[PDB]
Amino acid sequence: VRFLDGHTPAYDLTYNDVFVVPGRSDVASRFDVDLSTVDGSGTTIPVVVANMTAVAGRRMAETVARRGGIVVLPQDLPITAVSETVDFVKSRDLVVDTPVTLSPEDSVSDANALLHKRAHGAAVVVFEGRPIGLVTEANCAGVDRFARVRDIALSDFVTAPVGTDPREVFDLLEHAPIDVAVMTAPDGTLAGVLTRTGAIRAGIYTPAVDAKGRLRIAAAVGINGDVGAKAQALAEAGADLLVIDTAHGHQAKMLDAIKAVASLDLGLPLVAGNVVSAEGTRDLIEAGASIVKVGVGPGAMCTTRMMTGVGRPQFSAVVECAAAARQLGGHVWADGGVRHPRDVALALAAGASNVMIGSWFAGTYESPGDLLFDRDDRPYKESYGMASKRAVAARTAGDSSFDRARKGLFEEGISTSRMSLDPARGGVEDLLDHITSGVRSTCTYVGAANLPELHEKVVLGVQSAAGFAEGHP
Amino acid sequence: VRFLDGHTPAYDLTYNDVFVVPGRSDVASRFDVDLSTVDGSGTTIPVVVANMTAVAGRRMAETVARRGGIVVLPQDLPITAVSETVDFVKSRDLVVDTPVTLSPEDSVSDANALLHKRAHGAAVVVFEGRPIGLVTEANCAGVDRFARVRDIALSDFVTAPVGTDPREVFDLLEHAPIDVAVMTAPDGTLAGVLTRTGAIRAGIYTPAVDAKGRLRIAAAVGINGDVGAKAQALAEAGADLLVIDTAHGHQAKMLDAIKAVASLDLGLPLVAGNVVSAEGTRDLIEAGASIVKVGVGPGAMCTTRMMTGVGRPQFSAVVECAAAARQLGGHVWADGGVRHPRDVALALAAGASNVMIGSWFAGTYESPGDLLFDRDDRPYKESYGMASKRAVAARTAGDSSFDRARKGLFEEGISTSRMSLDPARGGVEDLLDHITSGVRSTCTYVGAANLPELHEKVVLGVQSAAGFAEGHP
Amino acid sequence: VRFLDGHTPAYDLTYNDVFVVPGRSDVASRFDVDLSTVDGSGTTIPVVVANMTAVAGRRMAETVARRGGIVVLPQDLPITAVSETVDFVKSRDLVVDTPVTLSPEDSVSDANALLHKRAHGAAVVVFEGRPIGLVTEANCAGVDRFARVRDIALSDFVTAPVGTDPREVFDLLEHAPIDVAVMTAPDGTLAGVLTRTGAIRAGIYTPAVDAKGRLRIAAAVGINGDVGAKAQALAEAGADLLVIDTAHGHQAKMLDAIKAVASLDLGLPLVAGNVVSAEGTRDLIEAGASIVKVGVGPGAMCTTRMMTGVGRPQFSAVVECAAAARQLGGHVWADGGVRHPRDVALALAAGASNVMIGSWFAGTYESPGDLLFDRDDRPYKESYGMASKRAVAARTAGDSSFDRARKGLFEEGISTSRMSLDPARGGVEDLLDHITSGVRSTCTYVGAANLPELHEKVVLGVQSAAGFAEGHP
C-alpha cells in the first residue's frame, strides 16, 4: 500500500487513524464496480458474517447469501442442527425470499411476534402449502392476543408465478396496498414472496452459489477434540468453506488442527485465525490454510485488550498480514471492529479479501435473537461474545460442576449488549445496501473497477483525531 | 508556507491542528487591511456562499454581494428561476437594502412571519409603490392573526432621499423610535431602507459589482447532461462566474465538462471541483479551469468520510492544492468545514484565494428556509446536503420509480440539520462582521496589509489537541 | 532546559503536554526553598496579578503584596484613582491586615454584604477610629435588613497592641470564639486585624516592599495616546514597576512606546508585551524593556485563537522567549492560561522569572467584583477580558456613537464568565498557599533551593493525553 509522503507514524493505526485520497478515475458509475472476491469464498460482495451464535442463524444465512455474502455457522452448533440449516439454505430460491408463514389457527399473539423474523412487513397465511391471506402489523393492532389469524387476515393479495421477471413484479406492486407479491408454484403452492425492494436488489446483487446453483454457507470448528472428524462431518453436511477459529491462532494446537484438516483433503477453502502478525500469517498458511483470519481484540464484544493488553490496531494488522499472505499466494479476512462502511472499505484497501462482521448484524430482523424493546419503545436485540460466561456456560454444560467452576476463571467477552435496530431500515439487507454503496463509492474515488484494483491503486494518509472529526457523523 | 523548525508531522493537518505565529507588523489599524481577492471572482471580502439550496437564495445573494461576497446559485435551479433571481440581484441598490414590504390588506399573521426574511426588524407598508407605514414585531404582539396590517401599522417614520450620505442617515436615526430610515425616490416611491448598522457597513464593505456597476452573482452547473448548453444559458442569463461542481472532481466526466465549457469561450471565471490532490488540481486547470474548488469530506452536511473513508484533512489539502494551482497561475477555493473565523483565516494562510461557506449561513434570516423554533423557543433553520435523500428526491423527481429506487442506494449527505440563529445577531451580515474582523486581525498579527501578503508572510506551527484547547471557545 | 532523550516532538507544547522528572536532592525541607525572583520586580513569590479590571483592585493589591506578589493596576484606571489606590497600599501595615469596618449606624443589610470583601470572617465596628465590637455572618442571620449594626455586634473581642509577635497572637486566639485579634495603636485607635492563619503566613511569606519599606504596586499603560506622559504620571504617583501592554506586542507602535518611556529614565523596571517569538523578545528588549510579557491567546477570557488562529502553545512560547531574553540579560513573564499550581511550576521551569495570573484570582473575596450566588447558592464572581465588548464600552464611552459603532466590529474577549469561589478557601491567600506549596515541592523534586536552580537543574519530558490523565484530577 502507498501512503502520502512523510506519513510514517511511530505507532500502529486503526481504521480511525487513516483516510483514502481520491485519484484519477474513469469509472463512470458506481454500479460499474465489480465487488466479487478472489479468495475462493465464492462471495460476490466482500462481506462475511461472523461465527457468532447471536448473529449466524438460518434466516441470516439465507438472506445474506442471496445478496452475495456468506454466513459462518458457529462451532457450538450440533451436527444435526448444522445439517438441517444447510439443507434449508440450499433449498432456497435465488430470487424469491422465504416469508413468515402462519396457520389460520395461529393466535394473533404469535402472528405479531413472528412478523419481525423477516423484513417483509407481512406474513403469508398458508393452508396445506397454499397461500390464503396476508397478515401485517396493522391487522394485529388492537385485536385480542388470542383471536385467530383467520379473523384478521387480508383475503386479497397480489400473486405471480415463480420465475416471473423481477422487473415486472416491481411494476405489479406499484399501486398494491401491500408491498408483497406472493410467488406461487405451477400447482398453486407457496414458493415465497418478493417485495419492490427485493426486486430491485435482484438486479443489483448476485447470489453466492455453489457448483450446483444453491446458496453458499460456511461452518466453523474449534481446535479442541477431534478436529479432523468434526471438519469431515461439516464437509459431508454440505458446508462450502471451513473456518478453524480460536482466540490465539498462533499456538501449536492450532497448527496441528490445520494439518489434521488439510491432510483429509476435503477440497474446500480453509480459513484459520486469529493472528495479527506476519509470522503467524505465514505459519498458518504453511500449516495448510489458504485464508488467514486477522484480528485480536477489535471485536465489539471483546474484553481481551483490557484483560491482557494483547492486541493490535486492526488496520496495521491487516496491512502487515495481507502482505505476508500475498507473498505465499494466500488471502486475509479482516475480522472485528466494523462499525461503519468506511471500516469495510479501509480493510479492503489494506489488502483483505473479505471482511467479517459480527455484532453490527445482530441488530437486524434476520438475526437469531428475539426482538426486544426498551422503556422508550426503541427496538433492539442482544449480542454477546463467544468467549463470555454466557457462551462458555452453554458450550460446557456437559462438564462437572468442579470443572465448570475452575474454567469460570477466564472470561474475555461480554455476556450481554444492546444492539439497536434502525427504526426505518431494520433489515440486514438494508445494512448491506449501506455497506456496499460506500465500498462502491470508495472504488470510484480511487479509480478502481474491482477489489484487486482497489488495493493496487489506493493511496492512504494518516490523520489526527481532529482529522477523523471532519465531516458529519 | 513556512512552518516552525521541526514541525513536520507524520500526518495531514486540519484547521484545529495548526496555529499562526505573529510577526513584526507596521499595519497601524485593522481597518487598513485590504481584503480584496485576486482570483477574478470580484469579491472584496474572501467569502463565497456555497451552491446549496438551503443557503443560496436571492435574499442571500443580494445581501452578501452588497458586502463584498458572492453567492453561487445551486445547479438544481431552473433557468427561468435563475434569470428571475439574477435580474432581481442586478437591480438592487449598492447602499440601500431591500426591505420586507407589506400591503395594508395583508394579515397580521403574514406580517409576523414575513418580518424574519430580513434583519431590519421592521417591514414597510406600501400602497402603489409608496411607503405609508412601518410594522415591527412589537406591533403584532397580541393582535388577532387575521386583523389587517393597517390596524397596527406605525404611521410616522423617518424618510430620506436615495443618494443621501450614509453618515447623515446614521445621525438621523440616533433618537428615532425605530432604527429604520425609509429611502425614497424623487417621485416618492420606495427605494429601500437603511439602518444605523447598515450605514456603518456602507463605509466598511465595498460592494462586489460587475462592469455595469451591478451586484455580482454566480451560478453552478453539474457534469451530467449537456454541460455546454447549460453553461451558456447561465452565462446569457447574467452570471458573473460559473462553478462546475461534483463530489469526485477528478474523473473523466469532469474533465470533459470543463473542456466543453472552456471551448465555448464565455469570458467568465471557471471554477471546478472538488479535489484534494496536487495532481487533481493540475488536471482541472489544464482542462480549462481558472479556479479549483478544494474539499472532499469536511462539509458539515457530508457523510462521505464515514461512508467511504475518502477525504483529506482540509488544511493540508488546501496547502498542497494552492501551491499546485499557483505554479500554473491558477487559484484555489477552500470549500467546506468552516465553523469559526479562524478557519477562514487559516485557509487564506494556506494559500486559498477564497473561502466557500455553506451550513454556517443557513442559520440566518436571509437564507431561503423558513424560521423555526424548538421546544425551548430557540430560533433555528434547516440545513441539508446536496447529495442527501431529500435533495436527490427533488433533483430526480421526474424519473421512473424503478430508476429512483436504484439511485436510492447512494446517500452521502444528511437530509436535515438544525442550525441555530444567534438570538442577538441573527443576520448574515453579523456573521460577515464576525468573520472579516477575525481575518483583519490575523493580517495585522502577521504584518500583512492584504491577502497576498498574508500567504507570503505567515509562519505556522503544529499543535496537539491540548494546544487547541488553550483559550475560551 | 534539558529534555529526556528523543523527546523532540514535531509540534509545540502546552503545560499539559509536559512533565518534570525528579532528580537527586539534598533540600531537606520544602520550607528551605527560596521563592524570591531576580527580575527586578521585587516579588518574593513568583506571582504577579494581571492588569485586569475584574481582578486588580486595591484590596487585591494590598493582600498579595503583603504575601510577596505584586498587582498591576489596569491601564483604564484614571490617574486620580491610581494615586488614591497607591497611597492606600503604601500606608498598609506589613503584618496586620485591613479589616472591613462598620459604623454602628450602618444597616445589617450593608454589614452582611460588606463582610465578604475580606476573608477574615468578621468586620470591626468602629467609632471615631477605635474598635467597639465585631460583626460576623452569624450575627446577621435572621435579623431585619434595616436593623442597625449596634443591635447585633459582639461587645467583647480579643485586643492586642500593634507590633506584638505574631507567634503570641496565634496563642491568644487558641480559645477565642472569633478567630480575629483586633490590633490597636498606642492611643487605642484601630490598626487592623490578625487571624490565626494570618499570623502563620507572616512567618512564611515575606512582604514585597519598596526602598522605604512600603508594599509594592505596579501599573499598566497602553500604547495609544501620549505613552510617555502617561508613564511619567504613573511613576510620580508611586508605581514600582511599569507594564506597557497590548495584544500584538510585536508592532511598530509598541516599539515606539517602549523607547518613549525608556528615554524618560524613570528608574523603574519596564515590562512590555505580549509576544511569543524570540524575534519579538529581542526587539522589545532592544527598544528598552527589561522584562518581556509572553502569551498570545492562552488567557481564559480570550477568544483570539478562535477569531484569528493566531497564538502559540504557552510552554513552548515561554521556553523560546526566555532563552532569547537571557542572552540579552533580560527576563520573561509567563502571562495567561494558569489553572493549577503545575502551570506556575512549569512556567518557571521553562525559564520565566514571574508568572502572571488573571481570571483564577477573580473568584476570591479580595477581587473588586461583587460576590454573587447561582440558583444552587454556590458563590461565584464575574470575570471578563480587557478586549471584550464590556471592557471597550467603558474604555471608549467618551467617543462619538459613530466611532463606537465602527469599533464594535472587533471583539477578542468574552464579556462575562462565572468564576466559582472554593466554599472553604475563598481567599486569594488560600490560592497563594495552594500555588506556592506546589512550586516549593517542584523545587525539592528537582533538587533546587531557589528559582534560578529550578530552571538550571530541571529535566523535562513529553507525554500524550493519556500521560496527563495519570493521577487524580
Added chain:
Amino acid sequence: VTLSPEDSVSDANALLHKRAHGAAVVVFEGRPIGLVTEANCAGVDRFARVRDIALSDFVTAPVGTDPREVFDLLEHAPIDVAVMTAPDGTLAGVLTRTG
C-alpha cells in the same frame, strides 16, 4: 422613600419596596433633587453611591395642586411619580396617577 446621595445602591435597592410608588426621592437639604427606580440600580455595583444613578429629571408640582391636573401631568411621564413640593421648595411627598 427618601435617600441621601451618600446612601449605597444596596440600601437604595432594598428600601424601594417599603412603598408602592416604585421610585425613591433623593433629597439634599430637604429638597428633591433626583429619583431612583429599580431600573436605575440594575447592574450597578452594590456599594456605589446613590448620586451615581439618580435621575435628575422628574415631574414636580406644588402641594395643594388639584389631583386631576397632577394626573394629567404624568400621562406621558417616564416615571409615574410626581414630586410634590412645599412653597419653600422642600419635599412635601409624592403623588402617583392612581394616587
